[PDB]
Amino acid sequence: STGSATTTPIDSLDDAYITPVQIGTPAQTLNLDFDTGSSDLWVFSSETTASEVDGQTIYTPSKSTTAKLLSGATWSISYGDGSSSSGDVYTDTVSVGGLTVTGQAVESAKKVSSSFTEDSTIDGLLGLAFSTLNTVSPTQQKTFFDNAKASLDSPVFTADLGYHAPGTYNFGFIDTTAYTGSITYTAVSTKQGFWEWTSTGYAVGSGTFKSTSIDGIADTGTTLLYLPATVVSAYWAQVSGAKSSSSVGGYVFPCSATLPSFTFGVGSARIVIPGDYIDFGPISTGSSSCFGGIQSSAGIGINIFGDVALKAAFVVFNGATTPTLGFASK
């Protein structure tokens, strides 16, 4: 089996991407944030505190003939941006782009933090990291991908995120029309539950490539590219007037600037992030100070190849017994 679904930016900055997901019988379609950096599929629901729902589409288990309470199970998660959610658990039928899993754990939110309430376009998250990070207790649950894996033509999914445009998540096959050149595959460590890999270096604009190992995670659920302070400093030093602002919470640059590209290494291959991808617009409406898409990971504790990096590539998440990551230009 295979699945294929379109994923759409939630706003003009590509702050996140939503993909339609069918849950239950009859289908209830919710727009979820596919997150390769976490492993819970959770939704706004009929059980979510009413004051904490503002515009989202909710899952109502009582209206699904295939929904069953997973008795005793609870979940609670906190994300790297400080947001959180928690609740109880149902199993139900979940389909993505024609691909159906029966008995999928659907985590129903009783509580969500304000960040989630305030984002009307996101009805929940669909985790695609490794199932060892799943927060369901006392019985940990598998991700959608893990459940689908054995039925898939090939045990892979791919992320093809668009720049200010729709893109695609595919399950179970690699679309050879979707990228240019070859896919370069690189080793993954699952030791921390993430799609964790080591980039072989970087270049700023038309500068020479610096060979240096950068351990990081491929995370579709993070907006920006977070790299070591040395690297990020070398990048922003090439932008006139750029500076790190503690008041704003990272590097800003004059909106009149033209940004250089950023290149990262995948083995002997290179992925180029166009400078435009690194522009996240005025820090506040009408401001002439713009927020940078490359930021320091110092104090996160991990480097994150978020959407800024991933949307410059066709990315294969290979969940074979020995998992790997593949990157191609597109």
Q: Compute the C-alpha angle 251/329/18, nearest 5°.
A: 65
62 assigned to active site? no
Catalytic residue (one of 199, 261, 296, 297) = 199
Strand-pair partners of 245: 250
Measure CA 9 to chain center.
Answer: 12
User: H helices of the chain, where?
Assistant: 114-118, 144-148, 229-236, 307-310
Contact 149, 171 (CB under 8 A): no
Residue found by looking up tokens 């038309």 in the block: 206
User: For the domain that residue 167 is a member of, what is the CATH number?
Assistant: 2.40.70.10
Q: Are residues 181 and 170 in the same domain?
A: no
Contact 166, 179 (CB under 8 A): no
Q: Are residues 12 and 138 in the same domain?
A: yes
**3-state DSSP of 283-321:** CCCCCCEEEECEEECCCCCCEEECHHHHCCCEEEEECCC
Q: Give the three-state DSSP class for 170.
A: strand
How many residues are present in the chain? Answer: 330
219 assigned to active site? no
**Those residues with Cβ within 8 angstroms of residue 262's Cβ, 6 or more apart along the chain or in another chain:** 202, 203, 204, 205, 225, 235, 272, 273, 275, 278, 294
Q: How many CB atoms lie within 10 A of CB 276?
A: 12
Q: Are residues 94 and 240 in the same domain?
A: no
Q: Are residues 106 and 196 in the same domain?
A: no
Contact 227, 206 (CB under 8 A): no
- What per-residue string of b and e applies to 55-69 under the rule 16 or more CB within 10 Å gives b? ebbbbebeebebbee
Q: Are residues 167 and 179 in the same domain?
A: no
The domain containing residue 196 runs over which residues?
A: 175-330
Q: Are residues 109 and 205 in the same domain?
A: no
Q: Are residues 234 and 310 in the same domain?
A: yes
Provide the number of structural domains found in the chain.
Answer: 2
Measured CA to CA, the distance from residue 68 to residue 180 in angstroms comes to: 45
Catalytic residue (one of 14, 33, 35, 88) = 35
Give whole-number Cα distances, 8 to 116, 131, 136, 143, 195, in Å.
18, 25, 28, 21, 22
Measured CA to CA, the distance from residue 253 to residue 52 in angstroms comes to: 35
**Those residues with Cβ within 8 angstroms of residue 192's Cβ, 6 or more apart along the chain or in another chain:** none
- What per-residue string of b and e applies to 124-136 under the rule 16 or more CB within 10 Å gives b? bbbbbbbbebbbb
Among 121, 140, 174, give the residue marking a domain's end: 174
Q: Are residues 234 and 287 in the same domain?
A: yes
Among 174, 190, 222, give the residue marking a domain's end: 174
